[PDB]
């Protein structure tokens, strides 16, 4: 399979297969072909991406050419906080690989993105009613033309929602094509598919391809073998969860389910100090009414004094609103703050 690609299709919506959607009577010029496949390739990462958003980039840094997993359920907010890192980002270019969701959706998440943000995009589009081959297609078109303006000079972004909706549709094709089941109704081809899509984001010479996929996490007890295989193989995971989103602590970030495993080697040391005492004063914490509930009061307790002085800088900074826009500076700055 070879797709066709060029600098017209940013800002527009574009199909699994990566053919223009929207009903324009003139044609955008696509002169390239590209095959969908890209045998392997080595650069270090070394650079921050910004995110733009506090609590990641404050606490769980995000490096250039990474690979990075956001995990979340149902109604936790994972499509606010990916349109707040499409409107945040550092990236020249933004490919996003939208994939199994029904319309509405899709346009929900679409809503969140302004005409700025839009205009370097490239949207694959790919809801539930479509063939599972083009749902599969999706993930593979998408990192093609992440390729492609990479090797334009561009850094980009690639984001993948979702990687989980990705292997549910090779699944249905594999199946289809024979393959049994080998773990969790899922084939062969699914599991040996994911190291190669993920080999495929990275630094680079010219250019880079910073990558995000998300797992969706089902509310049950099952074991998701996708999730699992992912979870080895990314460089940082983003974790998001129902008892903060119950809250309505947005981003419903749970730091301490969450790590970057490039962070340290991107971040200042004395930002990697405060990010530490950042966290420690979040994990911390506890509700000053527990005490006096029982006949007030410190010691003695140095640590637990400081996050209940400091409570307030803290949520303040993690919890960020959708139009709340936060450069690296004042992220920095900011968590300096929190953090005395
Ligand atoms: N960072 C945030 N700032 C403000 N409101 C938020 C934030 N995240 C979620 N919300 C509120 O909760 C709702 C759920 O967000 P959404 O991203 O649509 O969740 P889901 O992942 O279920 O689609 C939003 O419509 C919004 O009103
Ligand atoms: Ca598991």
Redesign the pocket.
């Known amino acids: 399979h070879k797709i066709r690609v060029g600098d017209a299709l940013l800002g527009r919506l574009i199909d699994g297969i990566g053919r223009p959607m929207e009903s324009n009577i003139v044609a955008p010029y696509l002169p390239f072909e590209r095959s969908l496949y890209a045998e392997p390739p080595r650069q270090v990462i070394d650079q921050p991406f910004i995110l733009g958003v506090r609590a990641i980039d404050g606490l769980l840094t995000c490096g250039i050419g990474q690979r990075i997993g956001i995990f979340?359920g149902?109604?936790?907010?994972?499509?606010?906080?990916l349109g707040?890192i499409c409107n945040g980002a550092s990236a020249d270019i933004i490919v996003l690989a939208l994939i199994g969701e029904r319309g509405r959706?899709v346009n929900?998440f679409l809503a969140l993105l302004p005409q700025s943000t839009l205009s370097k995009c490239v949207l694959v589009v790919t809801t539930s009613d479509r063939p599972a081959l083009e749902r599969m297609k999706a993930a593979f078109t998408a990192t093609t033309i992440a390729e492609y303006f990479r090797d334009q000079g561009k850094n980009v972004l690639l984001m993948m929602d979702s990687v989980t909706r990705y292997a549910r549709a090779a699944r249905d094709v594999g199946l289809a094509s024979g393959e049994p089941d080998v773990r969790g109704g899922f084939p062969p081809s699914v599991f040996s598919s994911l190291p190669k899509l993920l080999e495929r984001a990275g630094p680079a010479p010219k250019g880079s391809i910073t990558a995000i996929y998300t797992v969706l996490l089902e509310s049950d007890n099952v074991n998701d073998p996708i999730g699992d295989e992912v979870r080895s193989i990314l460089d940082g995971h983003i974790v998001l969860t129902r008892e903060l989103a119950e809250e309505n602590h947005?981003?419903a970030i749970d730091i301490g389910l969450s790590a970057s495993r490039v962070m340290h080697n991107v971040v200042t040391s004395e930002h990697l100090r405060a990010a530490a005492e950042c966290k420690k004063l979040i994990a911390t914490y506890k509700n000053p009414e527990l005490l006096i509930r029982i006949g007030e009061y410190m010691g003695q307790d140095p640590e637990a004094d400081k996050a209940i002085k400091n409570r307030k800088l803290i949520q303040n900074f993690i919890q960020?609103?959708?139009k709340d826009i936060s450069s690296y500076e004042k992220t920095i700055e900011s968590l300096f703050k929190v953090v005395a």
């Open positions: 979340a149902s109604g936790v907010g994972k499509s606010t906080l707040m959706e929900e947005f981003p960020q609103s959708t």
